[model samples]
Target chain A: KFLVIAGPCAIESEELLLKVGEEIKRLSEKFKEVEFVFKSSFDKANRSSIHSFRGHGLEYGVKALRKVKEEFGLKITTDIHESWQAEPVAEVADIIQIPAFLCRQTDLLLAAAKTGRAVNVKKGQFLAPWDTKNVVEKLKFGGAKEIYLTERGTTFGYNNLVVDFRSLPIMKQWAKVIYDATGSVQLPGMREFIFPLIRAAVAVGCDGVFMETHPEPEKALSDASTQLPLSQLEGIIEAILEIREVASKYYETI
Target chain B: EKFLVIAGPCAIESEELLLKVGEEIKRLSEKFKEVEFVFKSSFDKANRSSIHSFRGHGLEYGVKALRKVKEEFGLKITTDIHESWQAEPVAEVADIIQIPAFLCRQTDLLLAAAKTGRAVNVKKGQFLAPWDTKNVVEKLKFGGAKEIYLTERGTTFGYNNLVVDFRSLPIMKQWAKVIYDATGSVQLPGGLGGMREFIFPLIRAAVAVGCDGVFMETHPEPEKALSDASTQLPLSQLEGIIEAILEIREVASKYYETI
Candidate 1:
């Protein structure tokens, strides 16, 4: 089963978490080959604008995530910016994510790896796909057996991002590579570009896809403009399933 | 009325070929009387992918060849310098001293070139943001460079590929005179192939977006040419492309709108 991590960009509240989790749980029952994991960050420490809202800080944030598994029975994945967050986040999260900006930091990777849970490292916007070898090595060295890598997007010029489909195959060589379809569109594009961007990544053989879907994206606390709407989440999964059929058919003939 | 048309080979292959390409570009300039044509060629190409790639004749001979072309064609010259020390001697022949994109951030090189009192054209590095070119301009100004030009080749899209952010033209133009390097823009850096077809489209869009100049590397026999062979516009096609650009420039010259 493909590991599809989907939820709000941040844990705005326990109520919104349940709303997002319930829809994802419904998708899990409908889509047989997809494993749904609830994803939301507790503290959005690295938002572009200081004026932007950060989520309920760690203690309350993990409690809400802990409730997600209790209610919907979905595995959780969330980001941890600081090294200390690694342990507590591992308790509730199936996968502890290293943010893109801090992906290259040695201490952060080591701390995240020190946790027994699987770690997902988002490739930095400035990094080359070939360079992820070191990132993969660091995680493996710190006593973590299961690891995943993600390609959100690379920096294009300024205040822009471009999803290089080539990155999927290149990084796939090192770890289970997931394409962050929602975050890739954060710096540019919108609902109009999201599906086509996801379709291209799926066709290129990414192991999974990451998305941030809110009940009301326009009102979301963070990445408000870029988050995929919860209304369209079901359609996104169904469309991706169709792409996989064609991909499988191509492989069968080969 | 001010259009800087800098054209030549990717690297100066021979004194004979420099004269041949120089003569063709010189002849092409006659059709447009108002355009300023500067012959551009690299003496030592330091950024070759492989350790064993050609960097033309050494700087000493390369300048000798460029000076010969300047004398024969009576054309002003421009060429890139890799190190700080090469700045003084290169300025002796080249009317404009160009800086490689990778070396645009080097403080010593900028200072050395600025000291030469020649016009400086800094190619924006593929990794740099369009807004960041202001820092490059400031460095030159700090070094007392009076005539400064900023050229955008392309930005690093992904590994081995580049995408020209046409938005970069208007953005950088706010700081200094902007030049679009169409030849370098089309280059795929790693496997080392050029997307040759996009040259016309990029040049057309860049001019329409409004630029002070356009930089293109052209040669007579591109297939047999040494460097940037795949990307260089063939000698016969130069007149057609520039003719197309000149008309667009006329419309663009009247006004430019920005976001």
Candidate 2:
């Protein structure tokens, strides 16, 4: 789909959401051919530390997302943590996402699938890419209408993640695949390695790109460490779009 | 300190085979006395690509066979345990109890092995990050484990392959003794052949990165072995593997000291 899912990692405020959402909406208008899905989390349920900020409560969070959709006319996507959150989140989200940590949880997969909404499952760091076939089967058995797979990164040694470009083609065989450009570079609070990773993801022929951006990343409450500066998003996207054009021709032959 | 080396067949197929490799290893140990040696083989190949593959003989018989290798050669022994119940019994005959890579994250299995009071050698799971091993080490520590070792086999690359991120050795050394699993590193996962010839360079890299030990599986005739037949180093190649690791470690030792 050449889809771009972009927004802050969490819904820090309705104002921030609108600001980032509106900017991506403009980029979508400029790009014309690429699809944009506004992505922001309602709750960061699987954060590394207990004290880290989760987003605003789910009710207000979804309300803000609804406002973004209404004002911008952009499709919306938000992650669902537990089974209980699926229906309500699906009510507002154009696409429901499963975080990597919870990808193997059968009950959660069932709940998301049963929503009858398009589900995008991030492959778990602990899972083999080929093993994701079993996960897709679970979603289909639960009556999922459409499915998408995202490759963020896999655990490298300890404390670091490595992206296997090979996963892009492997996952594309089953469902639409998104390259989680920002998440792939997170050594849990580092942003220096983001740009090259984003470029590589595009060159490898990802069907979509997922990223988190903030107006002021340093002061942002959650994922403050990894989100790109809002100003840089356009330039990064411009580079990727150019790369994708060159990549598409190469992929056409092989 | 000189690093330890653990090598043997993937599984003990017969007493004669064990004796052949044991005598050869005994000779190598005398020539390279600066290095410690521990004999490794599995009693139960619990995790394999297919169910029909050969698991070793049952635990009782397998332990007896391994005990023979130990007593006859006057060498220490190590063997893998699949479930919690196998811990104590395997610990009785094996000097060190190993946790298979697939079972490394099982809390009960780690605890049971810890309670054996034998050194627990855990292979980092193909799906886990090297730093995440701290959580695994914590479980063993809480269970009152006195000595612990961590091994890096390989991480999942694609469907039927494994790739070793050499940085893992230095990363894991922070918490426990880390060993590079030379044989497992080249596994083609569900397929037959692994890049067995590359074990020489991989072991050199592990030594240069400062791993505390090396783990490998060898057979007198790898093509005839029952388990991991494609990956096991043939007996004829044993002396070269030892000399390469020793030579690399000797050249790297001075730099290791300054760091």
Candidate 3:
């Protein structure tokens, strides 16, 4: 019944972070049912090529996320890659994120959970939806309070992914299901305009939406192709808010 | 556990054509020592992209014709079946019943074939994780199957193309001998398939990844073949492909052989 923690893929700097945060706050106010937690990754792992920006290194990245929370009075979330990253990332991140690749790393799950931070684990491309149980058990044993599961897409053939909307209810056992619409429809390393049916996923019981936006995605520092354009946020939010209007009434509550 | 190679054209256009293809395949098996041959053709190719496009001759003609190939070559036969009932009659003479990639999830079909114990070869679905074939394998075992083989065709890549995930061969081989399909890998859109330019690399990729052996379709004049004509390697290319694959196999056997 939650909306999403949607925003830019990264904070270019202090100035840009506040700029996007204010805009997101304004949008959330416009659509009151749409709660926002502000989503972005401190580190961008699994980029196609190795030479891309690894993100404002861990320390500065944490500072940036904390700054957004302090300045805007908002909740923060970010993705972590390695087992060692869990402690530091969990420090500032309300929900310590597990990148799909590291979902099976029990140590990472235990580390993230010990911090008492809500854990949001992504299902790996090579794993079935039901396999999320192993991940949840890792966190539950560590005594995690809140949990969320997400699906970007499954490894199709090569260099691409395909979404099976049916994954929502099937994965409902682990946590709230979120669809990375922007990332799911991505051509992966290539920019293409295949608007992933986020609404379709939402209708099919996805509890939240996940998208990475950039003021100018084409010029963004990382994942420019998969990230959404900031300019289009207004239109996208309007459409989603409309869907939520009917969905709430149909289901008779949030 | 010997090298079993299945050969023949992709579809059965006519009785004369299939019998001719079956005879050549049988002769080739005899010429090459220890080669177990299976003549394959899709009569009711139920999975073709469009209904307008040709499906194989009707099921009656399809199985009956495959029965003819077994009669003429006096060898075991293989043909793919999509539905549950097709498995019943087709299993009568067809030595092996292949579960097409799309129908791998059809529990009824897999159970039906497994119950018959006719050497089921389950082709991995294009959209599935290689190891996820575990569910289907357990289903076959539950049906009392004495023998089973897992086949790695191609996975859905992007838009229209499919890519064979090479790592799958070893991963699936952990459960059973994995079969690699070289010809089906190059099937193009519009039913116009293309020859795999790097056939040796693919075969090596599979063997290095721990596949038991390879499955390929060959024709004397590949360009004249009815379906997947463009993708089928010429009969002349067969010797080279086989030779290169064996050299790699010898090295892999020494290293990973289950003693």
Candidate 4:
């Protein structure tokens, strides 16, 4: 089965999360092969500009995630920045994510790993492919059962980012690899390159894809530059499945 | 008033090759009389990835070779220094002393190059953010460098690859006279290899987008060059590419000045 982690970038509102959740549930049922997990961050602690939105407090954010989880029967996932937030977030999220900037912090990894929830660590834009090994071992040694390394594009130069397809297979030698399409495309006319990079990622044997989508992207609170429109989801998934059908033949396994 | 061009072999390779490149530049200088030219090469590639790679002759021999080029062709010279001590002797010959990208953060190196009273050119590190390089210029100015040049080579994309973010040219030009390193920008660092096809396209983009100067490595026969063979531009193609870029600047320079 493939993994599809999708939703708005941050928890803008509960009504918005549920509205996106209902369609996610519909897609999850339609495609039995894709394991759809609803994703919305509680806080965007590393926003470039201070004027940006950081979701509400943890208690209120968790309540919103729960609504999507139980009502639509979709698994929940969210990013956690601080060590203290891991346990509280783990209580609801089936998978907890370590932000790319904080991917190398040992204490945060241990906190997230120690919670016994599956942890997805984003490989930092500054990190090389092999650099993920330390993060993988740290999470594994900290008593985590399921560990995933997400490729969110390495730093190209200044504000730009680009995915190296080879990173997917190189990193998978340690753990399952996920290509984050939404986060990967940034600065320098991203929309056109999104699908091209995703198709290459799937052909290179990635375990899943993580994307942020909004019904009205211009109205979305975060990353309006790169977020996928909700309408485009089904089309890309159809393309990903076709690529996988041929990709699985050359690579070791799904 | 004129575009600056810094061109040469990647390493000294030979006195014969050095003279050969300088003579060609002398000829090209006559054609593009308005363009400023400086013969460029590296004496000690201290940061060469492999221990076995050719790093050219050490400091003394390197300065001698550059001085010979300056005397013979009447062209200005530029080269790099590994340590602070080499800066003084090398600066005697080098019109411009370059700071390698990896060593851009080393304060002592910048100070030493600045103290020589020669123009200092620094290649922004692959790992650095464009805005972060404002600090490098501050340090160089503090060290008394009257003329400072910031060169845009490329930035680290992944393990072995580097990508030229065209935006870096316009952004860094705000701080100082910017130079685009065409040969180095196409490098696949860590020895995965370089993409030779991209050298011209990158130079064209860098020039059209905006830059005060251009820097690149070349060889009489690139395939046989001892170091940087994969990325260095071949000798014959060098003049053609420079001529091609100069025409673009006629339009680019006028348009760039408006904003």
lDDT of each: 0.83, 0.83, 0.71, 0.83
Candidate 3 structure quality by residue, lDDT tens digits, B2-28: 676776677787787778777767767
Q: Write the per-residue lDDT of candidate 1 for residues B1-259, one digit (tens) a residue.
A: 4798999988989898899998988897777777899999998766554334566789998999999989988898999986677899999999889988755655657778988999999998765688878777877787788999999898777676888888888888888898999899998864447988999998999888889899999999889888887899898898899889989988876778753
Write model 2 residue lDDT over A189-210, tens digit each, in one string: 4688888888888887888889
| DockQ winner | 2
**lDDT (10s digit) by residue, model 1, range A1-254:** 78789999999988889988899999989887898889999887654333457778898899999999999899999997657778988899999998775565555677888888889998877567877767788778777788888998887767688887777777777788899998898662576788999988777777789998998888988888888989898998888878976884553111
- In terms of docking quality, model 1 is incorrect
RMSD of 4: 11.5
Ranking by TM-score: 2, 4, 1, 3
> Model 2, which residues run further than 4 Å from truth?
A1-254, B257-259
What TM-score applies to chain A of candidate 3?
Answer: 0.90
For lDDT, the strongest prediction is 4
Candidate 3 segments whose C-alpha is farther than 4 A from its true place: A1-254, B189-192, B257-259
TM-score of every candidate's chain A: 0.96, 0.96, 0.90, 0.97
Candidate 2 docking DockQ: 0.08
Q: What tier of docking accuracy does candidate 4 attain? A: incorrect
Candidates in order, TM-scores: namely 0.55, 0.56, 0.54, 0.55
For model 1 chain B, where is the 10-residue window of minimal lDDT? B46-55
Which tens-of-lDDT digit does each residue in B1-259 have in candidate 4? Answer: 6789999999987788899999998999989998999999887778888898888888878889889999999999999988999899998999999999999999999999999999999999999877788999999999999999999888886578787665566567767889999899888987658978667655655555568889989898999998889999999987888876776555345435322
DockQ of each: 0.05, 0.08, 0.04, 0.03
lDDT string, candidate 4, A1-254, tens digits: 78989999888888989999988998898899899989998788988889988878788899999999989999999999889999999999999999999999999999999999999998898898888988999998999889999998877657767565556666888999998988887763466556645665665567899989888888888888788888888877877766666445445432
* B-chain TM-score for every candidate: 0.97, 0.97, 0.90, 0.97
lDDT of the structure predicted as candidate 1: 0.83
